């Protein structure tokens, strides 16, 4: 029951510069014979993973040579050369020398590494055949966004909101290539009317400020 | 060149039973053994056990025995795992792969199965809420005046979400849904400008096929509500 | 000399044709059995590896209850092949033996029907090697190799079709070396199948020079080339080695050929089988089934070439027994066409008759002959021999027809009449009879079917032949030998005419019936003549007149032509021919024979190390077989797999090298030694014979021909005796010794359950070996036990074309063929069980051996690879030491042949002849006396033919001896010349003892010529050349004594005048000119003493004189002795001494012994003028 520990859950990479990723063993991955097994594999959204590089340093047949692996003992390591386009997916490793049960890695996605900036808060009151039905839906859209890793706070009352509100973390856009992701905050219209602020902010590298936009209930 | 390839989805109920099936071809199947692995959402890869293609003789993980059974069909050139009284932690995707019978684990899983996501449900058709947002009272942020279009509580998947019976192309943004208490969760925005919003129209639509309301919502200004 | 196939398979019956087709099918089933074999061992072996590698990655429940299963598979492949087999073997072999009967009973027919013109041409033995070898030859070729040839065709295509089917690269690869491998394998075979023809040729080349010192006995210590024959038979010998040399060379270089591709081969599809199970392409097992069937039908199509040979040969062979018997005579016995008489008168018509022999037809002896015989009369016919009294004897019985004119009996002709009926009325006594060598009541039995004992002794009592039987144990039941050997010739012609008399004929015909006969015996036959001459016609041919005197008339041939006719007065007072004749008349040994080869010892021990390493090549193969397939049955990095499966290839190519080069080494080393052996041993017996005394010889088991098959068969079987069982001893032992010992130390109980079979499997390699080419000779020898009686029946053609008794010596023929055909169809059967059954245990071994190897896998006690091992270790094993031990001579006959050999150079004869010790004296005179010597023959212990002689012989005293034909004539010529020294007497040489003299010294000094001339296969010069040895041959002398004896003219007239090459025994020319040869031969020794015996018994009347002109200007200082038949030599000598069964009668000068009238001047009265 060896266990792999893939170092980063997310590698920030450019286009035209390259990346590693390291992956750590529980025990030693060396084998009474003398050879070291731990496998990369990689996986693309949608698709069946490939193998890229097999055992200790080899690679497999039908594979570019930009990818290349060296290790030791109970660090491994990955490393692209001239990375493109097409190899941003998730890669992972998996470890064979004691296999019981086969043991994989946590995996990690590559980015694009794109130039800075911060989203533009939009805000909505809830929609009328809501306010008819009984509810609410406040939206707080973010859009051009950077890097992927923000953490957004709803508020009411100086209370934050932590239940009926997720966030759907798009991925990169394609021309543009800039991030977006959505927080909705929605309640019955009992206490819709107990609280008066639906603050929504963007807390993020780019700035620490919260950039806040809001409404009131009764402002309309 | 070698190909595997799945079934595709299969969104069964609680407490039932589910075969997957794993076709390969190109090949000698003889030989290899087929490896069945599970991997649940944004966790790591687990070992549920292998099947040896040649005699059908099978080994379990210690956490799946007696949860799954492997067969192999080999007029076919087929595998297949079935599950037994699926409970709602067996949502996830599912993965075959292929290893030697030679070498046995001091070769890797070279190829595999492209993967078929199985979902445990219990709920039913519904007909999709859409609701039209409107941007925020009064002031205007400029030129780029937002609106928007969402839903709450579908199921199942999917909705597809245009506007202006695609006839606006520009100011366009969409954001995956999110499945809570077995239904569904959807939003999307669009930026307009002063010249296209309050003064020209603006509309959302939803497509959900197990309840086949084609409906169009048009978003209007806000006045006083 | 190409028979077409349809023609051959005549005389089959339905129910034969029934059996070829089921043996044929049988042996297609048969055939195709063993590559099914090889698929499941595929399979079996891949549940065996997959079993193995899930059970060291899980770190074998299932293997017990699939090796259950796959051993019923095995069984019944079994079962199904034992059947088939058996099938196939005993119909193909009941089918041929049949056929064959039925082919050699009605060739015999076809060779009775025939006419002795046509069988007076060809050779008598060339019919008996006829019916022999080519019979022999067509039982083989369609016996059972029709058989094995379509089992060898399906057993090919159906391993390519399996191969085919289960993986087609590997199978093209195969197929892109299978045709080396079929002709390797085809060679191999055809080189194994034979080995006895190509060195019986080698040495059949030399066997000449033998033939010809043991063709000529007598006269060879007289030409004394002992020294000179020896080393042209070294030369012969030398000639022979080196044949036989090149021969084991090329035969070895062809076997290692084969072996190192078959191990190449293994190398290469092992290489890529394994780059293919490796890339996950193919499994083990698939790549194992497809090799070893691609493999075995490739081996198995080789094989069937002998099969074709041997149908080949067997056309060439059967075409001369169909033209014999697809001609037709122009007169059949066996036809009832023919016409028969009633009133059967005798009546002789001989008119306008010309008739030639067809040997020879360029010379007509006959001129036409014109005859009128009435009933009763007596004719005789008188004249020299050369006009053919004989001649026309047999013209009067149709063995021949005349080509000019007609002839006829009683009015109409016999060319329209029953040639049988016409034979069985003409009882004929012909000039030299031959008896049947059976009991003498069957003998005179012999003339017709039902006769009963009481016309038996009124037969006999008609010719007093009945004493000899009265003084004779077994009076009815006495077995008379061979050509009348038993009894004396008086009683044999006595008991020949009344074999003749009991046919009771019409026309009575003798010829020459008193040739041998006394006064009173001749008068009481003439007597019994004339008792039953009054109801038939009779002629009489003889010699001596008291029988003509009393004839009805009496004619004369000259030329051919008869001249005189008329009663006895009439050419009496005609004073023609006839008148001058009335008025002129009125073991112990045991292994001795290891020094035999002693000198040779560097060929012995390379022979033994190779011997050695050759059966040590099969645990060496055990052992990379078993380690390259569990390098696949466990789990391992594919980097090392591949390392360990190209290693384990390049070990197999190393291996055939090996091979190669030790099977080149055993096999020269082995063959050199044993021809050296050979050589030295046919050189030594040689000499050791030739040093051997005429008495030696003379032994009745001591035969010319009898010793010369001695040697070659012997001096070539002891050589087998010493190497071969060393050799085969030592490959066994480093085959099978070291084998369970490696299967005893990793797997112990699977190698006593296959102890408990190696012994039934080395057998089924022993038969199948004896199977390929060559089982058993044993019914040619019941055939010949129970063959002479055609041989008889063949060679006296003459007197079974007159009895008319053909049909009863063809029934006797078939009682003949009776026995060994039911023996035949049972071994037939017998054959057919054994083979299935041996084949079968091979196939079940399998099933055994696996299904206790996956027990034992199942509960860890060994793995899969120790297993295959003790399998491929053991029971290949034990085949391989069957297959090799077959090959082995065998030894009880080799030991028996080892021991006379042995025994014969031992032997030392009593008189030495290269001892020069002895008297010695510078001089002699050349005064012989002899005195009271009695000699008995050896042979002949109780019969003396000499009784005391005595003699004296002076200086130049033509001394002639006159005697019987066999009173002791050519005697005294072998007591003079060191051939027998006889038991009793006293002969003193000039007052010196011959028994004291050097030996060799009277054989140099005087000089001989023989009854009969023979001479060497060389040239006239080397003819003339071997009278005088150890001594430089001048040509000058050649030509002088050519010229002496008037052959001069003979030698220069022939092209390539002197180096012209005679044959055997001067058989290309004429007999007075190889006796005057004889003469010119015995004319360079200058004798101090000559003798000659029968100087003039085939020459010209003109050559005796210039033949006796040298010899009475040489009869001058020299002691001459002649003895002759013809009395011109016997006038003019000095003293004459006459002969009566071994007594001298009368000595003394000519003139004495014309005063005395005694038994001298009865001779000397006969043709005196
Ligand atoms: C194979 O079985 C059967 C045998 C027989 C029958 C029916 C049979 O049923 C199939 C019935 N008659 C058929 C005629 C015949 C005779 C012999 C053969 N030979 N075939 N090979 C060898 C061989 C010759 C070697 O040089 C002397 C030698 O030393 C280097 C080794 C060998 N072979 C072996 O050692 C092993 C090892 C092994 O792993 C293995 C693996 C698969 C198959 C066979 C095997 O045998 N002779 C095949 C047909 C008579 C004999
Ligand atoms: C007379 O004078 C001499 C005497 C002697 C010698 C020379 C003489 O010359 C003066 C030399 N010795 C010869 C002794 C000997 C005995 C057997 C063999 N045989 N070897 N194979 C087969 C075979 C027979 C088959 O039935 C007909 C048959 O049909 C199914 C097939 C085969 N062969 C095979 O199957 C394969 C397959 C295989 O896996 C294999 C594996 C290893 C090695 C070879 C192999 O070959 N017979 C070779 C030599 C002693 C006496």
């Known amino acids: 029951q060896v266990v792999m520990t893939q170092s980063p859950l997310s590698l920030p990479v450019s286009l035209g510069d390259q990346a590693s990723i390291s992956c750590r063993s529980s025990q030693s991955l060396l084998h009474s014979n003398g050879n070291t097994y731990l496998h990369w594999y990689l996986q693309k959204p949608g698709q069946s993973p490939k193998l890229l590089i097999y055992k200790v340093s080899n690679r497999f047949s039908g594979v570019p040579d930009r990818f290349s692996g060296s290790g030791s003992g109970t660090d491994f390591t990955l490393k692209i050369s001239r990375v493109e386009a097409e190899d941003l997916g998730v890669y992972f490793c998996s470890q064979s020398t004691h296999i019981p049960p086969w043991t994989f890695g946590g995996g990690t996605k590559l980015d694009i590494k794109r130039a800075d900036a911060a989203p533009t808060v939009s805000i909505f009151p809830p929609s009328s055949e809501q306010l008819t039905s009984g509810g609410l839906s406040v939206v707080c859209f973010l859009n051009n966004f950077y890097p992927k890793d923000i953490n957004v706070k709803w508020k009411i009352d100086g209370s934050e909101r932590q239940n009926g509100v997720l966030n759907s973390w798009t991925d990169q856009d394609s021309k543009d290539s800039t991030y977006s992701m959505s927080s909705t905050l929605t309640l019955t219209k009992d206490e819709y009317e107990r609280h008066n602020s639906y603050t929504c902010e963007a807390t993020h590298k780019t700035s620490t400020s919260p950039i806040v936009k809001s409404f009131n209930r009764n402002e309309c | 060149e070698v190909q595997l390839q799945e079934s595709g989805p299969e969104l069964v109920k609680t407490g039932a039973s589910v075969k997957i099936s794993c076709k390969a071809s190109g090949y000698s199947f003889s030989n290899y053994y087929i490896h069945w692995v599970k991997q649940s959402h944004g966790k790591s890869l687990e070992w549920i056990g292998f099947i040896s293609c040649y005699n059908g003789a099978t080994f379990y993980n210690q956490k799946f025995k007696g949860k799954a059974t492997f067969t192999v069909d080999n007029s076919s050139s087929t595998a297949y795992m079935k599950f037994n009284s699926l409970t709602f932690e067996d949502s996830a995707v599912y993965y075959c792969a292929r290893l030697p019978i030679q070498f046995g684990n001091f070769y890797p899983m070279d190829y595999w199965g492209q993967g078929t996501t199985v979902t445990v449900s219990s709920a039913k058709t519904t007909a999709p809420s859409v609701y039209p947002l409107a941007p925020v009272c009064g002031d205007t942020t400029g030129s780029s005046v937002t609106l928007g279009c969402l839903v709450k509580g579908y199921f199942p998947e999917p909705v597809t979400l245009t506007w202006n019976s695609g006839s606006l192309s520009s100011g366009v943004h969409t954001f995956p849904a999110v499945l809570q208490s077995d239904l569904y969760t959807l939003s999307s925005s669009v930026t307009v400008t002063s010249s296209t919003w309050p003064s020209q129209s603006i509309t959302c639509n939803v497509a959900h096929p197990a309840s086949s309301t084609k409906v169009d919502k048009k978003i209007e200004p806000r006045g006083p509500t | 000399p190409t028979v077409s196939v349809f023609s051959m398979f005549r005389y089959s019956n339905w129910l034969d044709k029934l059996y070829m087709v089921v043996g044929t099918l049988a042996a297609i089933i048969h055939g195709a059995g063993l590559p099914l074999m090889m698929l499941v061992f595929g399979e079996m072996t891949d549940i065996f590896a997959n079993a193995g590698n899930l059970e060291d990655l899980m770190s074998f429940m299932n293997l017990e209850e699939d090796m259950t299963r796959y051993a019923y598979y095995y069984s019944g492949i079994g079962a199904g092949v034992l059947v088939a087999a058996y099938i196939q073997v005993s119909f193909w072999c009941l089918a041929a033996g049949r056929q064959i009967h039925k082919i050699r009973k009605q060739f015999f027919h076809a060779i009775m029907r025939q006419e002795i013109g046509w069988f007076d041409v060809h050779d008598v033995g060339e019919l008996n090697t006829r019916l022999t070898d080519d019979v022999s030859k067509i039982n083989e070729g369609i016996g059972d190799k029709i058989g094995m040839f379509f089992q060898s065709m399906a057993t090919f295509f159906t391993g390519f079709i399996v191969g085919f089917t289960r993986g087609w690269k590997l199978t093209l690869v195969i197929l892109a070396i299978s045709p080396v491998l079929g002709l390797s394998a085809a060679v191999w075979a055809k080189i194994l199948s034979s080995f006895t023809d190509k060195e019986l040729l080698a040495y059949a080349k030399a066997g000449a020079v033998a033939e010809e010192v043991l063709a000529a006995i007598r006269t060879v210590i007289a030409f004394g080339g002992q020294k000179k024959e020896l080393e042209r038979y070294n030369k012969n010998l030398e000639e022979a080695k080196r044949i036989g040399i090149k021969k084991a060379i090329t035969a070895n270089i062809s076997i290692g050929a084969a072996f190192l591709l078959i191990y190449a081969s293994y190398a290469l599809a092992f290489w890529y089988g394994t780059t293919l199970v490796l890339s996950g392409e193919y499994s083990i097992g698939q790549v194992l089934t497809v090799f070893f069937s691609v493999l075995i039908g490739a081996f198995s199509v080789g094989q069937a070439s002998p099969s074709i040979e041997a149908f080949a040969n067997a056309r060439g062979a059967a075409y001369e027994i169909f033209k014999i018997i697809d001609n037709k005579p122009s007169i059949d016995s066996y036809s009832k066409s023919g016409h028969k008489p009633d009133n059967i008168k005798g009546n002789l018509e001989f008119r306008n008759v010309h008739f030639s022999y067809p040997s020879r037809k360029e010379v007509?002896?006959?001129?036409?002959?014109?005859?009128?015989?009435?009933?009763?009369?007596?004719?005789?016919?008188?004249?020299?021999?050369?006009?053919?009294?004989?001649?026309?004897?047999?013209?009067?019985?149709?063995?021949?027809?005349?080509?000019?004119?007609?002839?006829?009996?009683?009015?109409?002709?016999?060319?329209?009449?029953?040639?049988?009926?016409?034979?069985?009325?003409?009882?004929?006594?012909?000039?030299?009879?031959?008896?049947?060598?059976?009991?003498?009541?069957?003998?005179?039995?012999?003339?017709?079917?039902?006769?009963?004992?009481?016309?038996?002794?009124?037969?006999?009592?008609?010719?007093?032949?009945?004493?000899?039987?009265?003084?004779?144990?077994?009076?009815?039941?006495?077995?008379?030998?061979?050509?009348?050997?038993?009894?004396?010739?008086?009683?044999?012609?006595?008991?020949?005419?009344?074999?003749?008399?009991?046919?009771?004929?019409?026309?009575?015909?003798?010829?020459?019936?008193?040739?041998?006969?006394?006064?009173?015996?001749?008068?009481?036959?003439?007597?019994?003549?004339?008792?039953?001459?009054?109801?038939?016609?009779?002629?009489?041919?003889?010699?001596?007149?008291?029988?003509?005197?009393?004839?009805?008339?009496?004619?004369?041939?000259?030329?051919?032509?008869?001249?005189?006719?008329?009663?006895?007065?009439?050419?009496?007072?005609?004073?023609?021919?006839?008148?001058?004749?009335?008025?002129?008349?009125?073991?112990?040994?045991?292994?001795?024979?290891?020094?035999?080869?002693?000198?040779?010892?560097?060929?012995?021990?390379?022979?033994?190390?190779?011997?050695?390493?050759?059966?040590?090549?099969?645990?060496?193969?055990?052992?990379?077989?078993?380690?390259?397939?569990?390098?696949?049955?466990?789990?391992?990095?594919?980097?090392?797999?591949?390392?360990?499966?190209?290693?384990?290839?390049?070990?197999?190519?190393?291996?055939?090298?090996?091979?190669?080069?030790?099977?080149?080494?055993?096999?020269?080393?082995?063959?050199?030694?044993?021809?050296?052996?050979?050589?030295?041993?046919?050189?030594?017996?040689?000499?050791?014979?030739?040093?051997?005394?005429?008495?030696?010889?003379?032994?009745?088991?001591?035969?010319?021909?009898?010793?010369?098959?001695?040697?070659?068969?012997?001096?070539?079987?002891?050589?087998?005796?010493?190497?071969?069982?060393?050799?085969?001893?030592?490959?066994?032992?480093?085959?099978?010794?070291?084998?369970?010992?490696?299967?005893?130390?990793?797997?112990?109980?699977?190698?006593?359950?296959?102890?408990?079979?190696?012994?039934?499997?080395?057998?089924?390699?022993?038969?199948?070996?004896?199977?390929?080419?060559?089982?058993?000779?044993?019914?040619?020898?019941?055939?010949?036990?129970?063959?002479?009686?055609?041989?008889?029946?063949?060679?006296?053609?003459?007197?079974?074309?007159?009895?008319?008794?053909?049909?009863?010596?063809?029934?006797?023929?078939?009682?003949?063929?009776?026995?060994?055909?039911?023996?035949?169809?049972?071994?037939?059967?017998?054959?057919?069980?054994?083979?299935?059954?041996?084949?079968?245990?091979?196939?079940?071994?399998?099933?055994?051996?696996?299904?206790?190897?996956?027990?034992?896998?199942?509960?860890?006690?060994?793995?899969?690879?120790?297993?295959?091992?003790?399998?491929?270790?053991?029971?290949?094993?034990?085949?391989?030491?069957?297959?090799?031990?077959?090959?082995?001579?065998?030894?009880?006959?080799?030991?028996?042949?080892?021991?006379?050999?042995?025994?014969?150079?031992?032997?030392?004869?009593?008189?030495?002849?290269?001892?020069?010790?002895?008297?010695?004296?510078?001089?002699?005179?050349?005064?012989?006396?002899?005195?009271?010597?009695?000699?008995?023959?050896?042979?002949?212990?109780?019969?003396?033919?000499?009784?005391?002689?005595?003699?004296?012989?002076?200086?130049?005293?033509?001394?002639?001896?006159?005697?019987?034909?066999?009173?002791?004539?050519?005697?005294?010529?072998?007591?003079?010349?060191?051939?027998?020294?006889?038991?009793?007497?006293?002969?003193?040489?000039?007052?010196?003892?011959?028994?004291?003299?050097?030996?060799?010294?009277?054989?140099?000094?005087?000089?001989?010529?023989?009854?009969?001339?023979?001479?060497?296969?060389?040239?006239?010069?080397?003819?003339?050349?071997?009278?005088?040895?150890?001594?430089?041959?001048?040509?000058?002398?050649?030509?002088?004594?050519?010229?002496?004896?008037?052959?001069?003219?003979?030698?220069?007239?022939?092209?390539?005048?002197?180096?012209?090459?005679?044959?055997?025994?001067?058989?290309?020319?004429?007999?007075?000119?190889?006796?005057?040869?004889?003469?010119?031969?015995?004319?360079?020794?200058?004798?101090?003493?000559?003798?000659?015996?029968?100087?003039?018994?085939?020459?010209?009347?003109?050559?005796?004189?210039?033949?006796?002109?040298?010899?009475?200007?040489?009869?001058?200082?020299?002691?001459?002795?002649?003895?002759?038949?013809?009395?011109?030599?016997?006038?003019?000598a000095d003293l004459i001494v006459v002969f009566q069964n071994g007594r001298v009668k009368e000595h003394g000068t000519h003139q004495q012994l014309l005063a005395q009238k005694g038994i001298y001047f009865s001779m000397v009265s006969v043709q005196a003028g």
């Not at chain 3, 899969?864 to 077959?886: H, K, N, P, R, Y």
């Open chain 3, 364 to 1132: 007509k002896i006959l001129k036409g002959l014109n005859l009128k015989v009435q009933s009763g009369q007596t004719v005789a016919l008188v004249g020299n021999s050369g006009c053919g009294k004989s001649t026309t004897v047999q013209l009067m019985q149709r063995l021949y027809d005349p080509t000019e004119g007609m002839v006829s009996v009683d009015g109409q002709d016999i060319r329209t009449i029953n040639v049988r009926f016409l034979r069985e009325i003409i009882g004929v006594v012909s000039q030299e009879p031959v008896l049947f060598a059976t009991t003498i009541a069957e003998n005179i039995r012999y003339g017709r079917e039902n006769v009963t004992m009481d016309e038996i002794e009124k037969a006999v009592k008609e010719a007093n032949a009945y004493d000899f039987i009265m003084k004779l144990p077994h009076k009815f039941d006495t077995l008379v030998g061979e050509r009348g050997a038993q009894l004396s010739g008086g009683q044999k012609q006595r008991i020949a005419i009344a074999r003749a008399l009991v046919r009771n004929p019409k026309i009575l015909l003798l010829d020459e019936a008193t040739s041998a006969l006394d006064t009173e015996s001749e008068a009481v036959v003439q007597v019994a003549l004339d008792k039953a001459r009054k109801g038939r016609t009779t002629i009489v041919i003889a010699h001596r007149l008291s029988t003509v005197r009393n004839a009805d008339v009496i004619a004369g041939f000259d030329d051919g032509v008869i001249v005189e006719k008329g009663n006895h007065d009439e050419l009496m007072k005609e004073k023609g021919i006839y008148f001058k004749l009335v008025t002129m008349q009125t073991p112990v040994s045991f292994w001795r024979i290891m020094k035999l080869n002693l000198t040779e010892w560097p060929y012995f021990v390379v022979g033994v190390f190779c011997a050695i390493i050759n059966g040590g090549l099969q645990p060496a193969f055990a052992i990379i077989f078993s380690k390259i397939i569990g390098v696949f049955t466990r789990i391992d990095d594919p980097e090392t797999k591949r390392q360990n499966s190209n290693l384990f290839s390049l070990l197999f190519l190393a291996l055939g090298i090996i091979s190669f080069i030790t099977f080149f080494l055993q096999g020269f080393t082995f063959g050199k030694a044993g021809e050296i052996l050979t050589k030295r041993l046919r050189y030594m017996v040689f000499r050791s014979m030739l040093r051997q005394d005429v008495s030696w010889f003379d032994d009745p088991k001591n035969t010319t021909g009898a010793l010369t098959t001695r040697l070659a068969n012997d001096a070539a079987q002891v050589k087998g005796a010493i190497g071969s069982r060393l050799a085969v001893i030592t490959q066994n032992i480093a085959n099978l010794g070291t084998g369970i010992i490696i299967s005893f130390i990793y797997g112990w109980q699977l190698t006593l359950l296959l102890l408990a079979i190696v012994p039934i499997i080395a057998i089924a390699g022993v038969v199948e070996m004896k199977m390929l080419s060559g089982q058993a000779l044993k019914d040619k020898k019941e055939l010949e036990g129970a063959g002479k009686i055609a041989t008889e029946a063949i060679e006296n053609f003459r007197t079974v074309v007159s009895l008319t008794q053909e049909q009863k010596f063809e029934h006797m023929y078939a009682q003949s063929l009776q026995v060994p055909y039911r023996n035949s169809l049972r071994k037939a059967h017998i054959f057919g069980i054994t083979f299935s059954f041996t084949q079968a245990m091979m196939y079940f071994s399998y099933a055994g051996c696996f299904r206790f190897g996956a027990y034992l896998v199942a509960h860890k006690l060994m793995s899969f690879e120790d297993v295959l091992l003790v399998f491929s270790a053991v029971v290949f094993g034990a085949m391989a030491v069957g297959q090799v031990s077959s090959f082995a001579p065998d030894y009880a006959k080799a030991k028996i042949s080892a021991a006379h050999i042995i025994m014969i150079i031992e032997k030392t004869p009593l008189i030495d002849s290269y001892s020069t010790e002895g008297l010695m004296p510078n001089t002699l005179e050349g005064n012989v006396t002899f005195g009271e010597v009695v000699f008995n023959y050896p042979t002949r212990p109780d019969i003396p033919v000499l009784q005391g002689l005595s003699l004296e012989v002076k200086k130049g005293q033509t001394l002639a001896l006159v005697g019987s034909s066999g009173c002791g004539k050519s005697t005294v010529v072998q007591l003079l010349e060191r051939f027998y020294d006889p038991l009793a007497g006293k002969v003193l040489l000039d007052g010196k003892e011959i028994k004291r003299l050097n030996v060799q010294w009277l054989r140099a000094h005087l000089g001989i010529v023989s009854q009969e001339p023979i001479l060497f296969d060389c040239s006239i010069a080397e003819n003339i050349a071997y009278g005088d040895n150890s001594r430089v041959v001048s040509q000058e002398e050649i030509v002088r004594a050519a010229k002496e004896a008037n052959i001069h003219a003979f030698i220069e007239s022939l092209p390539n005048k002197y180096s012209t090459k005679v044959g055997d025994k001067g058989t290309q020319l004429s007999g007075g000119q190889k006796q005057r040869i004889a003469i010119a031969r015995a004319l360079v020794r200058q004798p101090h003493i000559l003798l000659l015996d029968e100087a003039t018994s085939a020459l010209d009347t003109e050559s005796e004189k210039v033949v006796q002109e040298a010899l009475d200007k040489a009869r001058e200082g020299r002691t001459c002795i002649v003895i002759a038949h013809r009395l011109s030599t016997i006038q003019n």
